[PDB]
Ligand binder design. Structure first.
Ligand code: NAD
Ligand code: NAD
Ligand code: NAD
Ligand code: BGC
Ligand code: BGC
Ligand code: BGC
Lengths: 344, 350, 350
């Protein structure tokens, strides 16, 4: 009935093939797919070139998915596709706040649709937590923690250690997932100030790579940080602690996680290298006894939801403003280098 | 042998001091003050040398020239007043872990000890705990490298102290930041050997303490949410001049799962560590984390009031330094105080 | 207003629950003693400020004693009726757990209470455990919804009581079904708040109690298989007029791995719950189970003998109801007798 939607993938390398294609193939029924393998392995129409402008091919495309490293995000998008298309940009909306704001402007005038690749928002336990906060079952949340820590899991295969493409280390690599979850469930985005510390300690150390989950790296060429910690004061008194790392001598490898302290109850999510099963634990007082409630994929869900928003004309879950606020906090943490607190 | 006057026979005189001095009886004998004079009496009949003294007025006990070491066991706003000439003019003093709730009054406390040529130490006994010493010994031997990220842990889901005036802001000066955070920042700063602050940022929370349902689940018991004058929690972010950052979390009531107190997390260049202690830990734990032979590994473990006390009495009997130095306790007091001052929603630069 | 208390039976529960808890609320009572062992009352009529104790070998005289206000029956299960219709002839009566082995003897115990204008409660102290109270309040708020399936756990793998007269039929009337099954059944019907029986089916087992090697492993040492005059276990299947169904298992000795007693399992329309307690459980447990935001979750916990005695004493004073109502205890007696009545190899309809 509904016409399939003609989709457009500009970059085609990791999250393009580790997520978008399969999500569009788990969901074929809704999408039209119009780095060689890609047109054939999942399309028939455009090519499998190596370029950027050989897209801009079949402008009859009505949706574009930019899975280009962070720097390309502002122009491989914005007027690029705001030229009149919908856009789904990848996990860090951009490495730079100024460029990030230059997209919500591009989209805000091309009144088409826009979302960002924050899929950890569709994890069943993440949704569980979002719903109980929206239901006010935690109360007013005044203290959160965004956990994006990796004892020794420096990614050694793609764009991630490139300070020019990606613009930073674990803080914008994985801290953006954790903080997105946190803010989103706290439903708090009014930032008052940001204090941060950024550590170059293990990345260029000689035995630094020793123990790394993905194998050794060259500490002589490591150009980003190995960890960072943030202190975020919200305009309502709520405070958010952040820690993000690819390599830190810390026991718990808990990433894409959050801890939430409300006036009525608490909750935390556990995920990452130290957790074979994701966990969600609510804590509260019930009948004058302290108690704990514990639990007894999201790639596809994220994408399907994306299409059904444009086809049906309604809002995609992760909203552009949300991802911009995540980019502005993480930029203000690196900005703390001025050994000063950034007021908003 | 050393004569001891005990100012304030509250929970701490009994729980820690009296049995500690006893076990160390070969070094001391005790002479008892507390405005509620009946608990000075009951205490005197249990730990009193023989013919003692049971004043309810502390300016009386310092008059007694047969007392040469005092142990200030009063609420915190008192610490400064006793223990300032009040004690220094009369004798050596052991003030409790808080020192002061005030930087300025703690400043005078240091000036008054010096100007008295007498010994001085604060009640930070959690450091003597063998796991804490193990870590300290290792950090001093460089076995964690340079510590660039530290966490001080002083959090309790619901264990607000109900046996005194811990919730009186005229007597305690504050709540959990100064009751229990002090213990953890100390262990953190002593292990890191870093008391040189540059910046302090903080958030203080008054949320669960005045909530009618708040006192629910509280070990220690129910409290009156209408007479809660202190915070239930605070969180901190301290940057040191070497660049190391320390995080602090303190609570008597927070809806968090992990009740870890008098504990630290230390992350360095060669290694890290974590001490676990609190209401969520029946056994105290120390874990080291390092990479050995291209493999990530963890090293775990397969009283303190007495050791602290003995060490103290011996230092005066022998003319030497007790472990807890007042400069250290003063630095903790300052940092804790700067956290509260980020009620100016400003980062305090040192 | 200290209440004058009389004790009929001084060993076991009296010496283990009553005398300690009576003492613990001494501010609301004084004791003024009996036992058939003329001397059994002494070690307590002297450890229990009876200052003038009637301390007698005959209950029927401790009853004519005018200075006795509240009579505690801690005698064996047969005596419960007699010593309780006699005391209702003037006194407030706390009879112990198995109100009676007999439905009729217990019905007689109630009319008497009514003809007395006095206070009546039963020793179902398990109701006062913090976690049993937790579940009851959740149920009462409808947080489990409609409870349609329940399980009463009164199972001991191998813990036959060998210290009293529990194995004697003429003194106890029954075995584990009314010795411990009564606790579990009471909790179960109390939190469902559903006492309207429709049918009881049951089975009673005489297998290990008179077996030669059944005493093997007994937690409380061996017993003589030729004196074992009751059942070692019994199971029951209770259907209620509202359609809810309760399962019951009770045992002193049965080859089941899980020793769970004084516990319950409730399955509701909105959520479920189970309580764990018994020789299998060093700590008591309470677990809620529900679907929350589309995921199956389980909510678990991160004394009572005195609480029971207090509310009972306080209820006498302010003329209010004790927590355990005689009608509820009678309901428990009737189901349990009906499990035995299935010696008719037939379902007993109510
Ligand atoms: N979990 C997640 O959501 C997640 C995880 C990984 C990466 N990402 C994000 O995905 C993005 C890409 O990471 P990655 O590992 O896919 O990258 P990748 O490098 O593996 O693949 C991207 C490729 O796009 C190509 N490309 C570059 N510039 C282009 C241009 N101008 N025009 C056309 N094609 C161009 C290059 O081939 C580049 O390698 C980043 O924004 C990263 O943050 C998201
Ligand atoms: N781990 C530790 O080292 C530790 C533990 C607990 C408390 N403390 C410290 O001990 C101090 C309070 O002691 P507490 O916890 O036992 O509470 P507490 O209320 O039981 O003790 C205070 C006692 O001193 C008496 N008092 C008040 N003012 C007095 C005065 N001018 N002169 C004499 N007596 C006075 C009070 O009657 C009271 O009995 C605090 O500074 C607290 O921080 C230290
Ligand atoms: N948790 C509980 O609620 C709990 C626990 C154990 C027993 N009980 C109940 O308490 C009762 C006694 O159990 P126990 O363990 O104390 O047994 P027990 O035999 O140790 O105590 C009963 C006492 O009653 C005395 N007695 C017997 N006949 C008497 C008479 N005619 N007049 C006066 N005194 C007489 C006996 O000498 C004995 O001292 C039973 O009904 C039992 O089911 C309740
Ligand atoms: O899941 C998000 C992150 O996963 C990690 O495996 C890597 O650091 C990146 O691929 C990515 O940024
Ligand atoms: O607050 C109650 C007390 O409990 C003790 O265990 C801590 O050492 C003290 O610092 C604290 O003040
Ligand atoms: O069986 C031994 C005893 O243990 C107690 O817990 C029960 O309440 C009694 O009814 C029982 O007789």
């Amino acid at each position: 009935g509904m016409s399939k939607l003609k989709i457009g993938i500009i970059g085609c390398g990791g999250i393009a093939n580790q997520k978008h294609f399969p999500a569009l193939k788990n969901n074929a029924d809704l999408n039209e797919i119009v780095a060689e393998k890609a047109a054939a392995e999942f399309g028939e129409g455009a090519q499998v070139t190596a370029d950027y402008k050989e897209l801009l091919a079949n402008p009859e495309v009505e949706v574009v998915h930019v899975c280009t490293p962070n720097v390309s995000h502002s122009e491989i998008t914005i007027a690029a596709f705001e030229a009149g298309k919908h856009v789904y940009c990848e996990k860090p909306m951009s490495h730079s706040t100024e460029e990030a704001e230059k997209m919500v402007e591009a989209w805000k005038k091309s009144g088409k649709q826009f979302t960002i690749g924050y899929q950890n928002r569709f994890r069943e336990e993440v949704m569980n937590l979002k719903k109980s906060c929206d239901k006010g079952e935690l109360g007013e949340i005044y203290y959160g923690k965004a956990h994006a820590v990796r004892r020794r899991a420096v990614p050694t295969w793609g764009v991630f250690m490139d300070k020019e493409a990606q613009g930073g280390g674990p803080l914008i690599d994985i801290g953006t997932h954790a903080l997105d979850i946190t803010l989103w469930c706290m439903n708090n985005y009014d930032v008052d100030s940001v204090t941060g510390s950024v550590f170059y300690k293990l990345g260029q150390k000689e035995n630094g790579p020793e123990g790394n989950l993905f194998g050794p790296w060259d500490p002589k060429t490591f150009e980003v940080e190995d960890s960072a910690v943030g202190f975020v004061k919200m305009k309502n008194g709520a405070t958010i602690g952040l820690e993000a790392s690819w390599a830190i001598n810390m026991l718990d490898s808990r990433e894409a996680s959050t801890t939430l302290c409300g006036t009525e109850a608490g909750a935390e999510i556990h995920s990452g290298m130290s957790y074979p099963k994701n966990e969600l634990i609510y804590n509260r007082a019930r009948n004058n006894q302290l108690m704990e409630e514990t639990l007894s994929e999201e790639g596809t869900v994220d994408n399907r939801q994306w299409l059904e928003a444009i086809q049906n004309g309604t809002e995609p879950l992760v909203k552009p403003e949300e991802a911009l606020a995540v980019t502005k906090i993480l930029d203000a943490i690196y900005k703390s280098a001025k050994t000063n607190t950034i007021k908003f």
